[PDB]
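Hi team,

As requested, here is the filled-out complex form for the chloride ion run. I kept the field names the same as last time so the parser does not choke. Let me know if anything looks off before we queue the next batch.

— J.
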Amino acid sequence: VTSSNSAEGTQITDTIGEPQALNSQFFTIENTLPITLLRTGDEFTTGTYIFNTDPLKLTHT
Amino acid sequence: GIGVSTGTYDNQTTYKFLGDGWVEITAHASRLLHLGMPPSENYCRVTVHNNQTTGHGTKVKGNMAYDDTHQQIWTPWSLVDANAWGVWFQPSDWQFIQNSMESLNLDSLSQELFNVVVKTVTEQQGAIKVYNNDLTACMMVALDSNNILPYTPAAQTSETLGFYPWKPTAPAPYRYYFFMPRQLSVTSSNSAEGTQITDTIGEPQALNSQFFTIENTLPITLLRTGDEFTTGTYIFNTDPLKLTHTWQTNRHLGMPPRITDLPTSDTATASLTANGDRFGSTQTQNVNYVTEALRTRPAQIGFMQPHDNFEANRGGPFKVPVVPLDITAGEDHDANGAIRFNYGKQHGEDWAKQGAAPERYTWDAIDSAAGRDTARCFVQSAPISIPPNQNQILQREDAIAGRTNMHYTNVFNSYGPLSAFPHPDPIYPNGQIWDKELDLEHKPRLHVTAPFVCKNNPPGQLFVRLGPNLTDQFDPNSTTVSRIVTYSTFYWKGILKFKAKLRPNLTWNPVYQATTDSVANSYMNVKKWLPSATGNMHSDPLICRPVPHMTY
Amino acid sequence: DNFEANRGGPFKVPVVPLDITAGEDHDANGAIRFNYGKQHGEDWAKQGAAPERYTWDAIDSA
Amino acid sequence: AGRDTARCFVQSAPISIPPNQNQILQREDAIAGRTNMHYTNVFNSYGPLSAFPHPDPIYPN
Amino acid sequence: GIGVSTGTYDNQTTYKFLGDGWVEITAHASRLLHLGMPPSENYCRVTVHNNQTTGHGTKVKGNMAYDDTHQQIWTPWSLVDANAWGVWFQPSDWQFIQNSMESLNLDSLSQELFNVVVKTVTEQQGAIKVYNNDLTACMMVALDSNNILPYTPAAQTSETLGFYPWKPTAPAPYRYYFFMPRQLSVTSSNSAEGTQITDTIGEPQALNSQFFTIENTLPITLLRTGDEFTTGTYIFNTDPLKLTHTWQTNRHLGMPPRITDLPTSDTATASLTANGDRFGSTQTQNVNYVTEALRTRPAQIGFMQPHDNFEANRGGPFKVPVVPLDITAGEDHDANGAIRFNYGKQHGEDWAKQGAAPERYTWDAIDSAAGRDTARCFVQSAPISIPPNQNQILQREDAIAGRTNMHYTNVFNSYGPLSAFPHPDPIYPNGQIWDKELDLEHKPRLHVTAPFVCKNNPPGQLFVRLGPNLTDQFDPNSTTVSRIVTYSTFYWKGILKFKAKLRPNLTWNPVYQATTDSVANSYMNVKKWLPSATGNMHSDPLICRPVPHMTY
Amino acid sequence: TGTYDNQTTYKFLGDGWVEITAHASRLLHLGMPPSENYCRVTVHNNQTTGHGTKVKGNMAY
Amino acid sequence: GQIWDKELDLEHKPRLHVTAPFVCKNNPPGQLFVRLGPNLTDQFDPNSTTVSRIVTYSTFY
Ligand SMILES: [Cl-]
Ligand SMILES: [Cl-]
Ligand SMILES: [Cl-]
Ligand code: NA
Ligand code: NA
Ligand code: NA
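And here is what came back:
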């Protein structure tokens, strides 16, 4: 953290590190999901999903 | 039933897989206990007042933090407490669970006392001691099923049973807090010498006095050598504990901005489109542009906590607890509630180490996404202008109320409706496992000292003590007490069951695992978990929640 | 306008979108400003790289 | 569950004991150069770890 | 069936736990393949003879090891081979299996080809190429169920399918060895210049000639764009593979000698009773005493192997394979069969690396108890005397037949009825998985190139090729061939199932696990399994059998 | 292989309850990816001029 | 405005989200991914980093 008023000699530390073992997560679509191939005569459906959420008031207080 | 055992020793951990990744971890634990007669035969209302005017006293200026004054009810009873990870699993077990499972939950608890032996000591000449069996003598046992008596987690003061099966242990003596008024005024070393420090302790109050006795509240079982005692099975009702840690911070939530083009070489960077022309949303409408730092995120992961905040009630001053989060790059320990504890040889300290001083360790939250780097934090005046001149930005350096070291971050509370954070990590082996909830209408969202809080009523405390072994001469109307020197030993078996689930595996890259190595002086060197040439053991805190997990 | 920092970097802490009052204290009550393209509202006629911008002020007044 | 504002205080960290006047904020100290405005006046300690009883019923009003 | 897909892409690995620690690992693998027309339309009997008198030729003195001469039948067909660990699991999977399981076995194999597309290429002007669909064109497929044709494991020459799902691959061209006499004489650089090196290759022999054609031996399916082809499920019959390594060597087998007293301090040693008075047994009856080194053990763990032994048959000289065991402290690589292999970018090499040179890696057996430290080995004359004078002990230094570098260990064979050793480790991801057994009355106890050898008949090889796409002008009686430039692409899905069992956990100390780290330049640095700024991947061989296990 | 439909239909079940069914349809365009593989890209605006992070007081950028 | 949102996978969750009115109590609707299949040319080498593909694009409803 610095400000325009802040002394000129002051050096700004701006660093970025190497990928960490504890937090690295590399996913690929190919390896995690089943994939459907669609040629011109094909089509694809998700089927119906049911929401479970709370109502939203349409009035203000 | 003199010459026949009344129980079985068993300290093995068995895993039963029911399929679908579900596992039934049954931890058997057994220890040989030693119980000596109480120094006093009755209940005492003891007071501790360290109001010395020198050293670590409370009378010396600026020594509030050193306060130890309080009143307690000392009882002739002892408590058998096994509420600590170290009692149930051997290192490897903990490792295996942490590396392969992703969820863990308490299922049931059972315990029993058996093979009781009572002995008396008499003198001889040279003088040597002789030990005899008092077959008819007995040991008293009581179980508080409804938790009527004050809850006292022994793990908090390293007084649970020993973490080594082949080594004997002893129960901790039972004692509990009693109300006593306590006032202590605030001062600093700089503070004027003439200034007088008020250090007072009052008389027992009618509105808050509670004196309980085991004898008057619980049914007591007498155990002679041929007897044994069981608690029966207790069923836990607690929430599951995640065995993974989170890493996504507010900066990693959602759709990353779209890069303009792919890097040109393996060493190059890529650039986004101009701040002024980028799409997105912010909550600062004084500037016409979006940036990863200004961009609106769903909620706030982690939050600023007041440190090192001390508050005061009738009882006295005390350090307000804080949620254990990541200590960040900056390593702001106290600001993110890192926990430091000191323990004995029975609970980890190297047996070889000598001196009164205990072993100490500082636990840093595994999670890397909810901590706070106080140094890099700051608040900007609005309407917001960028860049800000020194008068429109409050940062670390700036001092509060003209105090060089007191910065805004010290009294800043960021907690709010949008705050989200992980659960404190379980700590093997010194950590407490479960905890009784506070009997208050409005309860806390969690406890710092334990991962599992009983929604209903927690398992009851197990109390023991030797029966007064009187001598030939006894007078009731006399305060004088004569008793035959007696002590006893007995075994304790406990059965703790967990329900755990094996982890999924979807990342392409290998994941971080808890391992051991041969590199000298490494924290994870195999040599630390092996015996020495003369059998000295050493059990250091083990890592946990090694595997990372998506937060959003 | 509170900024906090983690391993990742500095970031503006979000705030609950409430009424901006008579005083019109925008940032203090989390008004939301967003910039969007022609596909999502911007006038198709408008020209230039700059997107259209709008500031949403919570309907609630209490 | 009450609070004795007078005896309350905050200590700078890393924490040192005893603290010199510059590493401890207490009642006396004034905020924004105002004699009677102390930190306790604008301090909010509420948090995930806060627990307290329910207000008492008041007979007969 | 023109505009409709005929299959599903799926490359996910699913774990199904049946309980009791049993797991059903189902590995789905899918790749997009590219097939071009064959350079030649027919079968060729090609010969390779590197008999140059300079460089790496066989005519230069002492260059036997460089021999590459042989004859082969080159076929216009291509082989789809997925027999390699890298095809089925992503790094993390392998890690998870190695860290948590203790046993692994092959269960079933299934494959299918689908979504076939055939295209023709024609020219244009500026000249640019244009691509069109040949809807009516077809691709030929054949499956050798009974393994009539020569078995050719593509893993041996890094020619299996690519280890990256999102990247395209291609089948390897089919070819097989044909008998041809081959003689090459032994020489050394020191060997006299006038000496003439005999380097001969003979004419095809009647007794050993076998020319097979796909057309004449297998039924062939024609696949047009709307067709698809399935192998149906094959069931493996192989033995389980241990996922642990052994450490006990002959020196750690049985009852350790009884120490006289426990060490006096944590730094002290303990001593046994005098050699002359100690109880026990030895197989050297010239000395009246027992010692850990002389003491009789149950059997011999590991054994001495002849290296670098070259033998010769009609075909030519060849390096005799050796059982992959531990390379010891001494690091005697060739003496313990360490395996070194070179592979392409499709199979691991860093995509970023440039130059014709492939990436190379040397695999050292995980097991630490069966290797041999040639340096420290030795043979003592009997009757045995201790200590032995230089004339009654043969050691490393001593030279055989007056050759400075040829020591007895080079031609010593220790194999015998008492030899016991572990199975070669599986090698992810370059390693072959299963292998066909040799059709000889007396078979080998194992194979070096693969962990699973099919007791019965192995899964059949899958062959493919483009159908000759003729032009308007064609003459049969002419050797001239004109064909329309054609190529095709199609998908391949495979399903490999394993039966594996979760490991037990009984040691007190934490056990060695395969982990990842952040330390720069570490072999196990996370950065190796992540993509680069431009997407360059790198998949190095991963450790396996990390957990130790009792041998006796 | 499908039907285009972008109409919003209201179905009143009575008692004031309504079932709003929103149909939405669009024609999409998909071009091939610039790169065939997965990339670990980094963005670092650490310039010492303009809207860089190296200039004093530019954290927000 | 966004309509629904996935809840944060943390033991202690936020009372709401700023970016959306409906937060899925359970699991939210899954994301729909698409991409063109590599359309290779006559010349292709796996051991090469070089990629040649036929220019392709698609449209669908
Ligand atoms: Cl109980
Ligand atoms: Cl097959
Ligand atoms: Cl959906
Ligand atoms: Na600190
Ligand atoms: Na504003
Ligand atoms: Na070697």
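Two things worth flagging: Residues 1-552 of chain B form a domain with the Empty Capsid Viral Protein 2 fold (CATH 2.170.30.10). The pocket of chloride ion (ligand 3) is lined by residues A 46, 49; G 29-30 (CB under 6 Å).

Thanks,
J.
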